[PDB]
């Protein structure tokens, strides 16, 4: 179904790189046509005006992740977040924007209601003086509370290009806790690419090693600033590398197309689309 056999992928990438990525640019032009005739009426509602970081980056109605409604609060079921397809499921991941000050509580409610044990953060809170995402997790000195939830920082290990944080999410009305592990990649510029495929692959190997041991609960929640660009590139990397290993096939164009049906702008620059292919190529060279 358009899938490329593993043995054929290296040649496919080289063909699309010719003439300054002439083949990749045409594939990206075709991908940019996908999914625009779908409604965004919930995200566009006046009640939800202050809940979207970017007016022109909104979830589609059919694939948005609803929150449980709060009695007499219109729009309380809305968060800028979408179910994203994976290897096995159309709900394998959740892509969401970087929380705003006024949606940090909704974000943690999303984590709780989905029972997601894994967060992936691909943005810094501020980049070159420009705000990208709220620092939505607590410091180790004081837990933070939102609605019926208490969030506690339990541990934090800092590496050269990423940080892993261990969090405890307690729903006070239920007396039930959720352990959440946050994988924060700290060297991926907005609308750009990491410095090399090797460092992103190292981050991915760590994340996938964790996920292959943590499959209880809901989908991993992946986010950046808009929740489309760095988010879509990482999700595509993980799905395609697992497709490579579990099926011996790779279908990047097909997967990004499915992603665009669920949420706009996934893999947000042509450079990120090319970078995605160069990472898979490096994973084969490393193999």
DSSP at 50? G
In degrees, rounded to 5, the angle at the alpha carbon of residue 50 between the alpha carbons of residues 44 and 53 is: 85
Nearest of 124, 78, 82, 118 to residue 102 by alpha carbon: 78
Cα torsion at 222, 103, 167, 266 (round to 10°)? 0
CA 171, CA 186: separation in Å to the nearest integer?
A: 29
* Strands 149-158, 144-146: pairing kind: antiparallel
* CB count in 10 Å sphere of residue 203: 25
* CB count in 10 Å sphere of residue 128: 8
The structural domains of the chain, ordered by start, are 4-286 (3.90.190.10)
The data reach a resolution, in angstroms, of: 1.6
Nearest of 27, 36, 17, 12 to residue 254 by alpha carbon: 27
CA 82, CA 91: separation in Å to the nearest integer?
A: 9
CA 218, CA 215: separation in Å to the nearest integer?
A: 8
Q: Give every CB contact of residue 180 below 8 A, 6+ residues apart in sequence.
A: 111, 116, 117, 118, 119, 166, 167, 168, 169
* CB count in 10 Å sphere of residue 161: 15
For 207, list phi and psi in degrees, rounded to 5.
Answer: -65, -45
CA 266, CA 226: separation in Å to the nearest integer?
A: 10
For 33, list phi and psi in degrees, rounded to 5.
Answer: -85, -5
Q: Give every CB contact of residue 254 below 8 A, 6+ residues apart in sequence.
A: 1, 2, 3
Q: By the 8 A CB rule, do 201 and 208 touch? A: no
Structure-token match 């011996």, residue found: 248
Q: By the 8 A CB rule, do 273 and 17 touch? A: no
Q: Give every CB contact of residue 219 below 8 A, 6+ residues apart in sequence.
A: 83, 84, 86, 89, 91, 92, 93, 94, 114, 116
Structure-token match 């760095």, residue found: 230
Method: X-ray
In degrees, rounded to 5, the angle at the alpha carbon of residue 52 between the alpha carbons of residues 50 and 57 is: 150
């Amino acid at each position: 179904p358009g899938d490329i056999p593993a043995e054929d992928f290296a040649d496919h990438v080289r063909k699309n790189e010719r003439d300054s990525n002439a083949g990749f640019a045409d594939e990206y032009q075709q991908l940019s046509l996908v999914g625009h005739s779908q409604s965004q009426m919930v995200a566009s509602a006046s009640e939800n005006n202050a809940k979207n970081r970017y007016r022109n980056v909104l979830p589609y109605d059919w694939s948005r992740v609803p929150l449980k409604p709060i009695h007499e609060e219109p729009g309380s079921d809305y968060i800028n977040a979408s179910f994203m397809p994976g290897l096995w499921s159309p709900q394998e991941f959740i892509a969401t924007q970087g929380p705003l000050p006024q949606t940090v509580g909704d974000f943690w409610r999303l984590v709780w209601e989905q029972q997601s044990h894994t967060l992936v953060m691909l943005t810094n809170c501020m980049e070159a003086g420009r705000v990208k995402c709220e620092h939505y997790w607590p410091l180790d000195s004081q837990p933070c509370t939102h609605g019926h939830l208490r969030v506690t920082l339990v541990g934090e290990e800092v590496m050269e290009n990423w940080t892993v944080r261990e969090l405890l999410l307690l729903q006070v009305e239920e007396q039930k806790t959720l352990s959440v592990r946050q994988f924060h990649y700290q060297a991926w510029p907005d609308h750009g690419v990491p410095s090399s495929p090797d460092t992103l692959l190292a981050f991915w190997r760590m994340l996938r090693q964790w996920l292959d041991q943590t499959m209880e609960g809901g989908p991993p929640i992946v986010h950046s600033s808009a929740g489309v660009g760095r988010t879509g590139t990482l999700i595509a990397l993980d799905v395609l590398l697992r497709q490579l290993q579990s099926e011996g096939l790779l279908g990047p164009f097909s997967f990004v197309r499915k992603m665009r049906e669920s949420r706009p702008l996934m893999v947000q620059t042509e450079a990120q689309y090319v970078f995605l292919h160069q990472c898979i190529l490096r994973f084969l060279q490393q193999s």
